[PDB]
Amino acid sequence: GSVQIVYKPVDLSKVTSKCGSLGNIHHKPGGGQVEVKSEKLDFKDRVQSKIGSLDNITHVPGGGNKKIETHKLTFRE
Amino acid sequence: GSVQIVYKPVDLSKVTSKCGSLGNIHHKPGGGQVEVKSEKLDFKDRVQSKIGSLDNITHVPGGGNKKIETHKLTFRE
Amino acid sequence: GSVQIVYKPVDLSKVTSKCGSLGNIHHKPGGGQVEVKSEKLDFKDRVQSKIGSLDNITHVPGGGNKKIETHKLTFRE
Amino acid sequence: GSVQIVYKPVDLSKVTSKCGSLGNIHHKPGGGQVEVKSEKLDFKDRVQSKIGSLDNITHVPGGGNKKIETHKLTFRE
Amino acid sequence: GSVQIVYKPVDLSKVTSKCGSLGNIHHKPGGGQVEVKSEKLDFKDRVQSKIGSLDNITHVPGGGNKKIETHKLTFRE
Amino acid sequence: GSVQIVYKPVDLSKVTSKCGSLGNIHHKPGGGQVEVKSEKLDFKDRVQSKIGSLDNITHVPGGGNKKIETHKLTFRE
């Protein structure tokens, strides 16, 4: 017995943007209050966390485009 | 017995945008209050979490386009 | 018995951006208050964490494009 | 003709307070936003004013008692 | 003609306070935003004013008592 | 014609306070933002003013008592 696998996916996909001007962007928050109370924390594998935060983000990319692609080929005998 | 698999998907897909101007964008929050109370936290594999947050985000990408694609080819014997 | 695997995915994908001007971007927060109270913290493998934060980010990339791609080929006998 | 005025008001009035303890007082505001827009202001005699304010006051007097008294005696001929 | 005025008001008034303890007083504001816009200001006699303010006051007097009194005696001929 | 004025007001008024302890007083503001914009200012006699301020005051007098008194005696012929 013989097994042949040919894995040849072809990609020609374009993700693109055009813009004239980014322009006036104003981000003026007036800060509040946050309180968190806890006794014990206990984190193990691959935990990702935020506790007690007051964060402001202004994010103005000129493009900001994304292309996420994953190829997988498991085999067994 | 022989098994032949040919995996040749072809992609020519375009994700694209055009814009004249981004223009006036104003983001002016007036901050509130947050309180969280807890005794014990216990997180294990692949937990993702936020507790007690007061966050503001302004996100103005000029394109902001996404293309997410996944290929998978499991095999067994 | 013989097993042949050919893994030849072809990529010609472009992620691109064009912009005229980035322009006026103003980020003027008015800082608040944060309090966090805890007795014990206990973190193990691959934990990623923030506690008690008041952070401001202005991020204005001229492109800001991303292309994330992963190839995997497990085999067994 | 003769005019006699005797002005002899007698005051023995007490304004008083007693207290055991002032105790726990917490004042935790989360700041908002204020905007005021105007072209021209024009103020004359005895004007008292506030424009565009975000103020917090905690006032805990141990007594805090007031006694306001006014005596007046106009005369004409 | 003769005019006699006797102005002899008697004051024995006490304004007083007693307190055991002032105690825990917490004043924790989270600062906001204020904007004021104007072209022309024009103030004359006895004007008192505030424009564009973000003020916090904690005032804990041990007594804090007030006694305001005014005597007036106008005469004409 | 004769005019007699006797102005003999008697004051025995006490303004007083007693306190055991002043105690824990905490004043922890989180500073905000203030902007003021103006073209012309024009102030004349007895003007008192604040523009564009971010002020914090903690005032803990052990007594803090006030006694304001004014005597006036105008005369005309």
Author numbering:
A (entry chain C), B (entry chain A), C (entry chain E), D (entry chain B), E (entry chain D), F (entry chain F): 304 to 380
Please, what does the article write about this entry?
The PHFs and SFs are made of two C-shaped protofilaments, each containing a cross-β/β-helix motif.
Tau PHF and straight filament (SF) structures from the 63-year-old case were determined to 2.7 and 2.9-Å resolution, respectively, establishing complementarity to AD tau filament conformations at high resolution. For case 1, cryo-EM 2D and 3D analysis revealed the presence of both PHFs and SFs, totaling approximately 76 and 21% of the selected data, respectively. The docked atomic models for tau residues G303 to E380 were in good agreement with the map and confirmed the tau conformations are identical to the AD PHF and SF structures. Indeed, alignment to the AD structures showed no substantial differences, with an overall α-carbon root mean square deviation equal to 0.5 and 0.6 Å for the PHF and SF, respectively. As with AD, the filaments adopted a characteristic C-shaped fold comprising a β-helix turn (residues 337–356) and an antiparallel protofilament interaction interface across the 332PGGGQ336 motif for the PHF and residues 317–324 and 312–321 for the SF. For example, we expect that the cleft of the PHF fold in DS bears an identical pocket for stacked small-molecule binding, as we have demonstrated with the positron emission tomography ligand GTP1 and as Kunach et al. demonstrated with the positron emission tomography ligand MK-6240 in tau PHFs from sAD.
